[PDB]
Amino acid sequence: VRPVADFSPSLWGDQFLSFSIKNQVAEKYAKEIEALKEQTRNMLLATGMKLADTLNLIDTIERLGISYHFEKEIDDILDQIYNQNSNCNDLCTSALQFRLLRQHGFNISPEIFSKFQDENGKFKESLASDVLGLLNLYEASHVRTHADDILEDALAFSTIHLESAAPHLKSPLREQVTHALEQCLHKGVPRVETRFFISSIYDKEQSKNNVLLRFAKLDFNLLQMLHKQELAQVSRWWKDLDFVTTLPYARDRVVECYFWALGVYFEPQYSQARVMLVKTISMISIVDDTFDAYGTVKELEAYTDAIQRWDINEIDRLPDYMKISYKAILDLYKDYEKELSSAGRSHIVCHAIERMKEVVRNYNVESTWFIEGYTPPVSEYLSNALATTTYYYLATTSYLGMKSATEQDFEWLSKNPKILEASVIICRVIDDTATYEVEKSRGQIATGIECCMRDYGISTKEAMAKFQNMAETAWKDINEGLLRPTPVSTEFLTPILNLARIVEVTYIHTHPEKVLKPHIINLLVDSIKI
Ligand SMILES: CC(C)=CCC/C(C)=C/CC/C(C)=C(\F)COP(=O)(O)OP(=O)(O)O
Ligand SMILES: [Mg+2]
Ligand SMILES: [Mg+2]
Ligand SMILES: [Mg+2]
């Protein structure tokens, strides 16, 4: 006597099911991009260029979403800028220099902001009329670490004056400022912010560089073609599983899952990774629905068991419907091994597998707590709820497709590094805040905010505030974990960073779909008009 599958159908239909790439256009773009790519490189390798202009060039190339073509050129430049400790006496260039360096790992000192502060250690209110300065200070305030108390007030300071000046600014600056106030650059999904910058800002910029803009538009549209194919291939794979009918309780959200994967990494070199990642997200999506929307305490107990043993032989031990899920799961991981066979990497799949078992264990626990009406203290709660975010698992899963991933990297990840923990906390803490009303007005009395309220004996307001600071602390920890020397290559940190970004974008508020729909249309449907 299970509950009624109230979930909603995919508003996408087969819109993505079949996509065929016009090879002519694709090659036309490719050929010109190569040319524009080289012209751009020469813009970077140019000499006798001022600091402010050099930083603006790098900032622009990054916002245009094409900096992944110049990881080395950009690096060398920021490196020398870091080492020359040059001091441009104005907020705007300082804040921009600060941010760019920190996002790239260079631990530049926040002492660069003192000249802009009074002896009391607070920003000179006289700066309130320098909109560009405030904007870059604003963006910079989001990349601070625990050691940057000098910037403790930058955010509120820049925020209040930007809101103040916004209405009377010209375009596209006005739109740019308003957009930053709603979404800072450092915590947004790269593709999303890049789509917005190219279309709503740089394209309306009078001073815009025609070469860069064209480069940016063609590159974004060319990569979109690859993305669309991937989503096509993944949509078919999902179709050839037919869970939409066999497992009616499970909701169809592959398109949204793919968006998530695209948020982790968008570059072409990570095409295989993305496809693997999205299949896992979709797959684990079912397991979730299975646990808190269809299975019985006894069936879930059996399910968690079979997952731990992980062997086809356990099938018969499971109910009929759970047989579909279980076999599908083992095959998926069997496919992963096959794809990695070609490069003798099938031996890493087990890391993702162990992380999945962990997610299952905790789902099962979450169920037991639900059934018993148990409300654990914050400490015990997080000990279980952190893994149920699925973040340790997705981060691990994101390495599977990365050619450069080695055992040492997974090794490092298995020890739950700070940066990963912070990304996981952010996801848990924000989901909890956003989903407190629901669930409450439902059984789940073990929700984070509830435990927090009972544990500390504080109101919902205060509990959400406490969770808010956990997320704040978490972001600072992430920014810290990006500073050189990094425990692993930066290439393996970005996915963790991006998982945290996705959380911020998906809950910038209602249901995720209504939040993701726009982004999905903007990244996988409408191309940027040239
Ligand atoms: C915000 C979070 C937690 C995850 C985002 C990344 C995704 C899509 C992971 C796959 C599993 C999952 C939690 C869902 F599909 C959504 O279910 P739902 O979130 O309603 O299930 P619960 O987290 O409440 O059990
Ligand atoms: Mg769930
Ligand atoms: Mg659940
Ligand atoms: Mg929730």
Coordinates of C-alpha atoms and ligand atoms in Angstrom, one line a residue:
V1 CA 0.0 0.0 0.0
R2 CA 2.6 2.5 -1.2
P3 CA 2.2 6.3 -1.6
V4 CA 0.9 8.0 -4.7
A5 CA 3.6 8.8 -7.3
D6 CA 2.9 12.6 -7.3
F7 CA 6.0 13.5 -9.3
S8 CA 5.7 15.5 -12.6
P9 CA 6.6 14.4 -16.1
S10 CA 9.6 15.8 -18.1
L11 CA 8.5 19.1 -19.6
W12 CA 11.0 18.3 -22.3
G13 CA 9.5 15.4 -24.2
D14 CA 12.0 14.1 -26.7
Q15 CA 13.2 17.6 -27.5
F16 CA 16.7 16.4 -26.9
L17 CA 16.3 12.8 -27.9
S18 CA 17.6 13.3 -31.4
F19 CA 20.3 15.8 -32.4
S20 CA 22.4 15.7 -35.6
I21 CA 25.4 18.0 -35.9
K22 CA 25.7 20.0 -39.2
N23 CA 29.3 19.0 -39.9
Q24 CA 29.6 22.0 -42.3
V25 CA 28.8 24.6 -39.7
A26 CA 30.8 22.7 -37.1
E27 CA 34.0 22.7 -39.2
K28 CA 33.4 26.3 -40.3
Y29 CA 33.4 27.4 -36.7
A30 CA 36.3 25.2 -35.8
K31 CA 38.5 26.6 -38.6
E32 CA 37.7 30.2 -37.7
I33 CA 38.0 29.6 -34.0
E34 CA 41.6 28.4 -34.6
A35 CA 42.3 31.7 -36.3
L36 CA 40.6 33.8 -33.6
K37 CA 42.2 31.6 -31.0
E38 CA 45.7 32.5 -32.3
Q39 CA 44.8 36.3 -32.6
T40 CA 43.7 36.2 -29.0
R41 CA 46.8 34.5 -27.8
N42 CA 48.8 37.3 -29.4
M43 CA 46.7 39.8 -27.4
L44 CA 47.8 38.1 -24.3
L45 CA 51.5 37.7 -25.3
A46 CA 51.6 41.4 -26.1
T47 CA 54.2 43.5 -24.3
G48 CA 54.3 47.0 -22.8
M49 CA 50.7 46.5 -21.7
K50 CA 49.6 48.3 -18.5
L51 CA 48.5 46.3 -15.4
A52 CA 44.9 47.5 -15.5
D53 CA 44.5 46.7 -19.1
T54 CA 46.2 43.3 -18.8
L55 CA 43.9 42.3 -16.0
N56 CA 40.9 43.6 -17.9
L57 CA 41.9 41.5 -20.9
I58 CA 42.2 38.3 -18.7
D59 CA 38.9 39.1 -16.9
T60 CA 37.1 39.6 -20.2
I61 CA 38.5 36.4 -21.7
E62 CA 37.4 34.5 -18.6
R63 CA 33.9 36.0 -18.5
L64 CA 33.6 35.2 -22.3
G65 CA 34.1 31.6 -21.3
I66 CA 37.1 31.1 -23.6
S67 CA 39.9 31.3 -21.1
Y68 CA 40.1 27.4 -21.1
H69 CA 42.1 27.9 -24.4
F70 CA 44.8 29.9 -22.5
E71 CA 45.3 28.2 -19.2
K72 CA 49.1 28.5 -19.7
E73 CA 49.3 32.0 -21.1
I74 CA 47.0 33.4 -18.4
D75 CA 48.9 31.5 -15.7
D76 CA 52.3 32.9 -16.7
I77 CA 50.8 36.4 -16.8
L78 CA 49.1 36.3 -13.4
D79 CA 52.3 34.6 -12.0
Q80 CA 54.5 37.6 -12.9
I81 CA 51.9 40.0 -11.7
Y82 CA 51.9 38.1 -8.3
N83 CA 55.6 38.2 -8.1
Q84 CA 56.1 41.9 -9.0
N85 CA 53.8 43.0 -6.1
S86 CA 53.1 46.1 -8.2
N87 CA 50.6 48.5 -6.6
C88 CA 48.0 50.3 -8.7
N89 CA 46.5 52.9 -6.4
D90 CA 42.8 52.4 -7.2
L91 CA 40.1 50.2 -5.9
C92 CA 39.0 48.9 -9.3
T93 CA 42.3 47.5 -10.4
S94 CA 43.3 46.3 -7.0
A95 CA 40.1 44.4 -6.4
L96 CA 40.3 42.9 -9.8
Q97 CA 44.0 42.0 -9.3
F98 CA 43.1 40.5 -5.9
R99 CA 40.2 38.3 -7.3
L100 CA 42.0 37.0 -10.4
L101 CA 45.0 36.0 -8.4
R102 CA 43.1 34.3 -5.6
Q103 CA 40.9 32.3 -8.0
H104 CA 44.1 31.1 -9.6
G105 CA 45.7 30.1 -6.3
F106 CA 48.1 32.9 -5.9
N107 CA 47.9 33.9 -2.2
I108 CA 48.2 37.6 -2.7
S109 CA 47.9 39.6 0.5
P110 CA 44.6 41.4 1.4
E111 CA 46.8 44.2 2.7
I112 CA 46.3 45.7 -0.7
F113 CA 42.9 47.0 0.5
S114 CA 44.3 49.0 3.5
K115 CA 45.1 52.1 1.4
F116 CA 41.3 52.1 0.6
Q117 CA 40.4 51.9 4.3
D118 CA 40.5 54.5 7.1
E119 CA 42.7 54.0 10.2
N120 CA 39.7 52.4 11.8
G121 CA 40.0 49.5 9.3
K122 CA 36.8 50.4 7.3
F123 CA 36.4 51.3 3.7
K124 CA 36.4 55.0 3.0
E125 CA 32.8 56.0 2.4
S126 CA 34.3 58.4 -0.1
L127 CA 34.7 55.5 -2.5
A128 CA 30.9 55.2 -2.7
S129 CA 30.9 57.1 -6.0
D130 CA 33.3 54.8 -7.9
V131 CA 30.9 52.2 -9.3
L132 CA 33.5 50.2 -11.2
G133 CA 35.6 50.1 -8.1
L134 CA 32.7 48.9 -6.0
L135 CA 31.7 46.3 -8.6
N136 CA 35.2 44.7 -8.5
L137 CA 35.4 45.0 -4.8
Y138 CA 32.0 43.2 -4.6
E139 CA 33.2 40.4 -6.8
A140 CA 36.4 40.2 -4.8
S141 CA 34.6 40.0 -1.5
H142 CA 33.3 36.6 -2.4
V143 CA 36.7 34.9 -2.8
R144 CA 37.9 35.7 0.7
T145 CA 39.4 33.2 3.1
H146 CA 39.5 33.0 6.9
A147 CA 42.6 35.2 6.9
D148 CA 41.0 38.1 5.0
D149 CA 39.2 39.9 7.8
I150 CA 40.4 43.1 6.1
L151 CA 37.5 42.4 3.7
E152 CA 35.0 41.6 6.4
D153 CA 32.9 44.5 5.4
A154 CA 33.6 44.7 1.6
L155 CA 30.4 42.8 0.7
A156 CA 28.0 44.9 2.7
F157 CA 29.9 48.1 1.8
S158 CA 30.0 47.5 -2.0
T159 CA 26.5 46.0 -1.9
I160 CA 24.8 49.0 -0.4
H161 CA 26.3 51.5 -2.7
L162 CA 25.8 49.4 -5.8
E163 CA 22.1 49.0 -5.1
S164 CA 22.1 52.7 -4.6
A165 CA 23.8 53.6 -7.9
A166 CA 22.4 50.8 -10.1
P167 CA 19.2 52.6 -11.3
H168 CA 21.0 55.5 -12.9
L169 CA 23.8 53.7 -14.6
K170 CA 24.1 53.4 -18.4
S171 CA 23.8 50.0 -20.2
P172 CA 25.1 47.4 -20.2
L173 CA 26.9 48.3 -17.0
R174 CA 23.5 48.7 -15.2
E175 CA 22.5 45.2 -16.2
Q176 CA 26.0 43.9 -15.2
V177 CA 25.7 45.5 -11.7
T178 CA 22.2 44.3 -11.1
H179 CA 23.2 40.8 -12.2
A180 CA 26.2 40.7 -9.9
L181 CA 23.9 41.8 -7.0
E182 CA 21.8 38.8 -7.7
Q183 CA 24.6 36.5 -8.5
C184 CA 28.3 37.1 -7.8
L185 CA 30.7 35.8 -10.5
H186 CA 32.8 33.5 -8.3
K187 CA 29.9 31.4 -7.1
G188 CA 28.0 31.0 -10.3
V189 CA 28.0 28.2 -12.8
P190 CA 30.6 29.0 -15.5
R191 CA 28.5 28.3 -18.6
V192 CA 25.5 30.2 -17.1
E193 CA 27.5 33.3 -16.3
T194 CA 29.3 33.1 -19.6
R195 CA 26.1 32.9 -21.6
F196 CA 24.8 36.0 -19.7
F197 CA 28.1 37.9 -20.1
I198 CA 28.4 37.3 -23.9
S199 CA 24.7 38.0 -24.7
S200 CA 23.6 40.7 -22.2
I201 CA 26.8 42.5 -21.5
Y202 CA 29.8 42.3 -23.9
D203 CA 27.5 42.2 -26.9
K204 CA 26.0 45.5 -25.8
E205 CA 29.4 46.9 -24.9
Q206 CA 30.4 49.8 -27.1
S207 CA 34.1 49.3 -26.3
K208 CA 33.8 45.6 -26.9
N209 CA 36.6 43.9 -28.8
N210 CA 35.1 42.5 -32.0
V211 CA 37.6 39.7 -32.2
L212 CA 37.0 38.5 -28.7
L213 CA 33.2 38.7 -29.0
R214 CA 33.1 36.7 -32.2
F215 CA 35.6 34.2 -30.7
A216 CA 33.4 33.9 -27.7
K217 CA 30.1 33.4 -29.6
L218 CA 31.4 30.9 -32.0
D219 CA 33.2 28.9 -29.3
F220 CA 30.1 28.8 -27.0
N221 CA 27.9 27.7 -29.9
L222 CA 30.4 25.1 -31.1
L223 CA 30.7 23.6 -27.6
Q224 CA 26.9 23.7 -27.4
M225 CA 26.8 21.3 -30.3
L226 CA 28.9 18.8 -28.4
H227 CA 26.8 19.2 -25.3
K228 CA 23.6 18.6 -27.3
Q229 CA 25.0 15.4 -28.8
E230 CA 26.0 14.2 -25.4
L231 CA 22.6 14.9 -24.0
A232 CA 21.2 13.1 -27.1
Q233 CA 23.3 10.1 -26.5
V234 CA 22.4 10.2 -22.8
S235 CA 18.7 10.7 -23.5
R236 CA 18.7 7.5 -25.6
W237 CA 20.5 5.5 -23.1
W238 CA 17.9 6.6 -20.6
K239 CA 15.2 5.7 -23.1
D240 CA 16.7 2.2 -23.5
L241 CA 16.1 1.6 -19.8
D242 CA 12.5 2.5 -19.8
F243 CA 12.3 3.2 -16.1
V244 CA 9.7 5.8 -17.0
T245 CA 7.2 2.9 -17.2
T246 CA 8.8 0.0 -15.3
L247 CA 9.7 2.2 -12.3
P248 CA 6.7 4.6 -12.4
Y249 CA 7.6 5.9 -8.9
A250 CA 10.9 7.3 -10.2
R251 CA 10.8 10.8 -11.8
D252 CA 12.4 11.5 -15.2
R253 CA 15.0 14.2 -14.8
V254 CA 17.9 13.3 -17.1
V255 CA 17.9 16.7 -18.7
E256 CA 18.3 18.3 -15.3
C257 CA 20.9 15.7 -14.4
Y258 CA 22.8 16.5 -17.5
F259 CA 22.7 20.2 -16.7
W260 CA 24.3 19.3 -13.4
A261 CA 27.1 17.4 -15.1
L262 CA 27.6 20.3 -17.5
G263 CA 28.0 22.5 -14.5
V264 CA 30.8 20.4 -13.1
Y265 CA 32.8 20.7 -16.3
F266 CA 31.9 22.0 -19.8
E267 CA 35.2 21.8 -21.7
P268 CA 35.3 19.3 -24.6
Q269 CA 38.2 17.3 -23.1
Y270 CA 35.7 16.2 -20.4
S271 CA 33.1 14.8 -22.7
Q272 CA 33.5 11.2 -21.5
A273 CA 33.6 12.3 -17.9
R274 CA 30.3 14.3 -18.3
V275 CA 28.5 11.3 -19.9
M276 CA 29.7 9.0 -17.1
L277 CA 28.8 11.6 -14.5
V278 CA 25.2 12.2 -15.7
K279 CA 24.4 8.5 -15.9
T280 CA 25.4 8.2 -12.2
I281 CA 23.4 11.2 -11.2
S282 CA 20.3 9.9 -13.0
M283 CA 20.9 6.4 -11.6
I284 CA 21.4 7.6 -8.0
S285 CA 18.3 9.7 -8.6
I286 CA 16.2 6.6 -8.8
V287 CA 17.8 5.0 -5.7
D288 CA 16.8 8.2 -3.8
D289 CA 13.1 8.1 -5.0
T290 CA 13.1 4.4 -4.2
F291 CA 14.1 5.1 -0.6
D292 CA 11.9 8.0 0.4
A293 CA 8.9 7.6 -2.0
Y294 CA 8.1 3.9 -2.6
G295 CA 10.0 1.2 -0.8
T296 CA 9.0 -0.3 2.6
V297 CA 11.3 -0.4 5.6
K298 CA 11.9 -4.1 4.9
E299 CA 12.5 -3.7 1.2
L300 CA 14.9 -0.8 1.8
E301 CA 16.8 -2.9 4.4
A302 CA 17.2 -5.6 1.7
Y303 CA 18.2 -3.0 -0.9
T304 CA 20.9 -1.5 1.3
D305 CA 22.1 -5.0 1.9
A306 CA 22.4 -6.0 -1.7
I307 CA 24.2 -2.8 -2.4
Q308 CA 26.9 -3.5 0.2
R309 CA 27.5 -7.0 -1.0
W310 CA 27.4 -5.8 -4.6
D311 CA 27.0 -9.0 -6.7
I312 CA 24.4 -10.0 -9.2
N313 CA 23.7 -13.1 -7.1
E314 CA 21.7 -10.9 -4.7
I315 CA 19.0 -10.1 -7.2
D316 CA 16.7 -12.9 -6.1
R317 CA 17.0 -11.5 -2.5
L318 CA 15.3 -8.3 -3.8
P319 CA 11.7 -7.5 -4.7
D320 CA 10.8 -7.4 -8.4
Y321 CA 10.9 -3.6 -8.9
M322 CA 14.2 -3.3 -7.0
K323 CA 15.6 -5.9 -9.3
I324 CA 15.4 -3.5 -12.2
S325 CA 17.3 -0.8 -10.3
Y326 CA 19.9 -3.2 -8.8
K327 CA 20.8 -4.9 -12.1
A328 CA 20.8 -1.5 -14.0
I329 CA 23.2 -0.2 -11.4
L330 CA 25.7 -3.1 -11.6
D331 CA 25.7 -2.9 -15.4
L332 CA 26.4 0.8 -15.3
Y333 CA 29.5 0.2 -13.3
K334 CA 30.3 -2.7 -15.5
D335 CA 30.1 -0.3 -18.5
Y336 CA 32.3 2.2 -16.8
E337 CA 35.0 -0.5 -16.4
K338 CA 34.7 -1.4 -20.1
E339 CA 35.2 2.3 -21.2
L340 CA 38.2 2.6 -19.0
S341 CA 39.6 -0.7 -20.1
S342 CA 41.1 1.0 -23.2
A343 CA 43.3 3.0 -20.9
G344 CA 43.8 0.5 -18.0
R345 CA 41.8 2.6 -15.6
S346 CA 38.9 0.3 -14.8
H347 CA 40.6 -0.2 -11.5
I348 CA 39.4 3.2 -10.2
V349 CA 35.7 2.5 -10.6
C350 CA 35.6 0.9 -7.2
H351 CA 36.1 4.3 -5.5
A352 CA 32.9 5.5 -7.0
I353 CA 31.3 2.2 -6.1
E354 CA 32.4 2.4 -2.4
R355 CA 31.1 6.0 -2.3
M356 CA 27.7 4.8 -3.6
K357 CA 27.4 2.1 -1.0
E358 CA 28.0 4.8 1.5
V359 CA 25.2 6.9 0.1
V360 CA 22.9 3.9 0.3
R361 CA 23.8 3.1 3.9
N362 CA 23.0 6.7 4.9
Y363 CA 19.7 6.7 2.9
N364 CA 18.7 3.6 4.8
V365 CA 19.6 5.3 8.1
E366 CA 17.7 8.4 7.1
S367 CA 14.7 6.1 6.5
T368 CA 15.1 4.5 9.9
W369 CA 15.2 7.9 11.6
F370 CA 12.1 8.8 9.7
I371 CA 10.2 5.7 10.7
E372 CA 11.2 6.1 14.4
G373 CA 10.4 9.8 14.4
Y374 CA 14.0 10.3 15.6
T375 CA 15.4 13.8 15.9
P376 CA 19.2 13.6 16.3
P377 CA 21.4 16.4 17.6
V378 CA 23.1 18.5 14.9
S379 CA 26.3 16.5 15.2
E380 CA 24.8 13.1 14.7
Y381 CA 22.5 14.5 12.0
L382 CA 25.4 15.8 9.8
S383 CA 27.3 12.6 10.4
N384 CA 24.6 11.0 8.2
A385 CA 23.1 13.8 6.2
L386 CA 26.3 15.0 4.6
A387 CA 26.8 11.9 2.5
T388 CA 23.1 11.8 1.5
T389 CA 23.7 15.0 -0.4
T390 CA 25.5 12.6 -2.7
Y391 CA 28.4 15.0 -3.0
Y392 CA 31.3 12.8 -1.9
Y393 CA 29.9 10.4 -4.5
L394 CA 29.5 12.9 -7.4
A395 CA 32.9 14.4 -6.8
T396 CA 34.4 10.9 -6.9
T397 CA 32.3 10.0 -9.9
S398 CA 33.5 13.1 -11.7
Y399 CA 37.1 11.8 -11.7
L400 CA 36.2 8.6 -13.5
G401 CA 36.1 10.2 -16.9
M402 CA 39.1 12.4 -16.4
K403 CA 42.0 11.0 -18.3
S404 CA 44.5 12.6 -16.0
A405 CA 43.0 11.2 -12.8
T406 CA 45.3 8.8 -10.9
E407 CA 45.0 6.6 -7.9
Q408 CA 46.7 9.2 -5.8
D409 CA 44.0 11.7 -6.6
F410 CA 41.2 9.3 -5.6
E411 CA 43.3 8.4 -2.6
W412 CA 43.3 12.1 -1.6
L413 CA 39.6 12.4 -2.2
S414 CA 38.8 9.3 -0.1
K415 CA 40.2 11.0 3.0
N416 CA 37.5 13.7 2.7
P417 CA 39.7 16.7 2.2
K418 CA 38.7 20.1 3.6
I419 CA 37.7 21.5 0.2
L420 CA 35.4 18.6 -0.5
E421 CA 33.9 18.7 3.0
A422 CA 33.1 22.4 2.5
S423 CA 31.4 21.7 -0.8
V424 CA 29.3 19.0 0.8
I425 CA 28.3 21.1 3.8
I426 CA 27.2 23.9 1.4
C427 CA 25.0 21.5 -0.4
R428 CA 23.5 20.0 2.8
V429 CA 23.1 23.4 4.6
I430 CA 21.4 25.1 1.7
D431 CA 19.2 22.2 0.7
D432 CA 18.1 22.1 4.3
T433 CA 17.3 25.8 4.5
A434 CA 15.4 25.7 1.2
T435 CA 13.5 22.6 2.0
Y436 CA 12.6 23.2 5.6
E437 CA 9.0 24.2 5.1
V438 CA 8.3 21.1 3.0
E439 CA 9.3 17.9 4.7
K440 CA 8.3 19.6 8.0
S441 CA 4.7 19.7 6.6
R442 CA 5.4 16.0 6.0
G443 CA 6.8 13.3 8.1
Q444 CA 10.6 14.0 8.0
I445 CA 11.0 15.6 11.4
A446 CA 14.7 14.8 11.2
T447 CA 15.5 17.7 8.8
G448 CA 18.6 19.8 9.5
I449 CA 16.8 22.9 10.6
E450 CA 14.6 20.9 13.0
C451 CA 17.6 19.1 14.6
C452 CA 19.3 22.4 14.8
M453 CA 16.4 24.1 16.6
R454 CA 15.9 21.3 19.1
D455 CA 19.6 20.8 19.7
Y456 CA 20.4 24.4 20.3
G457 CA 16.9 25.4 21.5
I458 CA 16.6 28.3 19.0
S459 CA 14.0 29.5 16.5
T460 CA 13.8 28.5 12.9
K461 CA 15.1 32.0 12.1
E462 CA 18.2 31.5 14.2
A463 CA 18.7 27.9 13.0
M464 CA 18.7 29.0 9.4
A465 CA 21.1 31.8 10.3
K466 CA 23.5 29.3 11.9
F467 CA 23.3 27.1 8.8
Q468 CA 23.9 30.2 6.7
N469 CA 27.2 30.8 8.5
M470 CA 28.2 27.2 8.1
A471 CA 27.9 27.7 4.3
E472 CA 29.8 31.0 4.7
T473 CA 32.6 29.2 6.6
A474 CA 32.5 26.5 4.0
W475 CA 33.0 29.0 1.1
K476 CA 36.0 30.5 2.9
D477 CA 37.4 27.0 3.3
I478 CA 36.9 26.3 -0.4
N479 CA 38.7 29.5 -1.4
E480 CA 41.5 28.5 1.0
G481 CA 41.8 25.1 -0.5
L482 CA 42.5 26.6 -3.9
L483 CA 45.7 28.3 -2.9
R484 CA 49.1 27.0 -4.0
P485 CA 50.5 24.5 -3.2
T486 CA 47.4 22.5 -3.8
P487 CA 47.2 18.9 -2.5
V488 CA 46.3 17.6 -5.9
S489 CA 46.3 19.3 -9.3
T490 CA 43.9 22.3 -9.6
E491 CA 42.2 20.3 -12.4
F492 CA 40.7 18.1 -9.7
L493 CA 39.6 20.9 -7.4
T494 CA 37.5 22.7 -9.9
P495 CA 34.9 19.9 -10.0
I496 CA 34.5 20.2 -6.3
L497 CA 34.2 24.0 -6.6
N498 CA 31.7 23.7 -9.3
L499 CA 29.6 21.3 -7.3
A500 CA 29.3 24.0 -4.7
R501 CA 28.5 26.5 -7.5
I502 CA 25.7 24.4 -8.8
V503 CA 24.1 24.3 -5.3
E504 CA 24.2 28.1 -5.1
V505 CA 22.6 28.5 -8.5
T506 CA 19.9 25.9 -8.0
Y507 CA 18.7 27.3 -4.7
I508 CA 19.2 31.0 -5.4
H509 CA 15.7 31.2 -3.9
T510 CA 10.8 27.0 -5.2
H511 CA 11.3 23.6 -7.0
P512 CA 14.7 23.1 -8.9
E513 CA 13.0 22.5 -12.3
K514 CA 11.4 26.0 -12.4
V515 CA 14.9 27.2 -11.4
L516 CA 16.9 25.2 -13.9
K517 CA 14.5 25.5 -16.9
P518 CA 15.9 28.9 -18.0
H519 CA 19.5 27.8 -17.7
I520 CA 18.8 24.6 -19.6
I521 CA 17.1 26.6 -22.4
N522 CA 20.0 29.1 -22.5
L523 CA 22.7 26.4 -22.6
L524 CA 21.2 23.5 -24.4
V525 CA 18.5 24.9 -26.6
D526 CA 18.9 28.5 -27.9
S527 CA 22.3 29.2 -29.4
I528 CA 23.8 32.7 -29.0
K529 CA 22.7 34.7 -32.0
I530 CA 25.7 36.1 -34.0
Ligands
LIG1 C1 20.3 19.4 -3.6 C2 20.8 17.9 -3.6 C3 20.7 17.2 -2.3 C4 21.3 17.3 -4.7 C5 21.5 17.8 -6.1 C6 22.2 16.8 -7.0 C7 21.4 15.6 -7.5 C8 20.3 15.9 -8.5 C9 21.6 14.4 -7.0 C10 20.8 13.1 -7.3 C11 19.9 12.7 -6.2 C12 18.8 13.6 -5.6 C13 19.1 14.1 -4.2 C14 17.8 14.1 -6.4 F1 17.5 13.6 -7.6 C15 16.7 15.0 -5.9 O1 15.9 14.5 -4.8 P1 15.6 15.2 -3.5 O2 16.7 16.4 -3.2 O3 14.0 15.9 -3.3 O4 16.0 14.1 -2.4 P2 16.6 14.4 -0.9 O5 18.1 15.1 -0.9 O6 15.5 15.3 -0.1 O7 16.5 13.0 -0.2
MG2 MG 15.1 12.1 -1.5
MG3 MG 15.8 10.6 0.2
MG4 MG 15.8 17.9 1.5

